[PDB]
Amino acid sequence: LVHVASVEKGRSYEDFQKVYNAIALKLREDDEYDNYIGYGPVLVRLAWHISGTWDKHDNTGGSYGGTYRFKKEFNDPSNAGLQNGFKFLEPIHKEFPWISSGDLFSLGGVTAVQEMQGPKIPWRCGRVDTPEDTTPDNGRLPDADKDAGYVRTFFQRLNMNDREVVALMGAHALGKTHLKNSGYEGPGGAANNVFTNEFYLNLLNEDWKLEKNDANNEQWDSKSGYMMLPTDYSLIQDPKYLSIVKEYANDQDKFFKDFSKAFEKLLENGITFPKDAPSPFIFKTLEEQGL
Numbered sequence: 001l002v003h004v005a006s007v008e009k010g011r012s013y014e015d016f017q018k019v020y021n022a023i024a025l026k027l028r029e030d031d032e033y034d035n036y037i038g039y040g041p042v043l044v045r046l047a048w049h050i051s052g053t054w055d056k057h058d059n060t061g062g063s064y065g066g067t068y069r070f071k072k073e074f075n076d077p078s079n080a081g082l083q084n085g086f087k088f089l090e091p092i093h094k095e096f097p098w099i100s101s102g103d104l105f106s107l108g109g110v111t112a113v114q115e116m117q118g119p120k121i122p123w124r125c126g127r128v129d130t131p132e133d134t135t136p137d138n139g140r141l142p143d144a145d146k147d148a149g150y151v152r153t154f155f156q157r158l159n160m161n162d163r164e165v166v167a168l169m170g171a172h173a174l175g176k177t178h179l180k181n182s183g184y185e186g187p188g189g190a191a192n193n194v195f196t197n198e199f200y201l202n203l204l205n206e207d208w209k210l211e212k213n214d215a216n217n218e219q220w221d222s223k224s225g226y227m228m229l230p231t232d233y234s235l236i237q238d239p240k241y242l243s244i245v246k247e248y249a250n251d252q253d254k255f256f257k258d259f260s261k262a263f264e265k266l267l268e269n270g271i272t273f274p275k276d277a278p279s280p281f282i283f284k285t286l287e288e289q290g291l
């Protein structure tokens with residue numbers, strides 16, 4: 001099962017920078033969403049969930065085919081809430097109808113990370129929409145009520161190692177859990193629409209108490225009003241994860257560089273890029289363009 005990247009006909013860096021810019025401008029404009037968190041976090045989660053269906057064993061799922069647009073995947077219980085991200089991107093797709101769905105969803109996540117002052121994430125075009133019957137069944141995205149061994153084994157299916165898993169999880173500084181979406185409630189820190197290494201600092205420095213929420217699920221709560229999922233907290237229960245948590249808590253630049261690599265890899269799993277494919281694009285932020 002081979003998915004070969006195919007550049008949208010005649011398109012180049014400038015075309016994709018325009019799509020970036022439209023996403024970034026709408027991120028700025030539609031600022032009220034989710035009690036003024038804005039759409040950044042949900043777009044990052046959308047990019048991850050459309051990628052996280054991948055299975056290295058047979059190359060099913062993954063970002064390439066854009067299959068989130070089909071009802072089976074759109075209505076995955078694991079994807080509850082992501083409809084808000086898709087609705088955000090609808091006017092973008094209308095303005096730029098030539099971009100593939102997988103390119104749009106993945107570019108949304110890259111744009112969100114960068115516009116929230118995160119690391120640059122190199123991004124490659126050429127995902128191609130595939131038919132409805134290529135949509136992966138529900139149940140490939142991870143549960144949150146589990147322990148470190150679960151997390152480790154889960155991410156092996158995505159070809160991610162301990163350092164890549166701990167780096168990716170730093171995205172949980174962003175946005176919040178919403179009780180009605182996932183059965184968990186609250187943010188992981190204070191700056192939840194700015195991309196920082198706060199997730200690791202909060203894991204190490206807050207006083208965490210294991211409580212039940214209003215959906216009768218356990219989660220870890222701090223008196224500052226932050227929360228951790230059981231799978232988040234597992235990163236300080238397992239000694240191998242804990243060492244990497246401490247590394248990223250103590251080195252912002254290292255976290256940014258490792259996140260950027262892991263997130264690009266996540267968004268590109270399953271895709272074969274021709275030797276003659278364009279190099280990865282690194283988009284300028286609005287701020288860098290004076291826009």
Ligand code: HEM
Pocket residue numbers: 041042044045048080081142143144145151168169171172174175176177178179181182183184229231263
């Ligand atoms: C063991 C792996 C993970 C689990 C179990 C997990 C679980 C969750 C859950 C339950 C939520 C709350 C959804 C809702 O109520 O709205 C959430 C939110 C989020 N997740 Fe994860 N996640 C995992 C990994 C990741 C990864 C790898 C990324 C991306 C690099 C990521 C990005 C996000 C973001 C940005 C949000 C906030 C969304 C919002 O505010 O709307 N997650 N995750």
Ligand SMILES: Nc1ccc(N)nc1
Pocket residue numbers: 172173174175176177186187188189227228229232
């Ligand atoms: N989205 C999110 C926020 C906080 C935590 N701990 N996990 C996930």
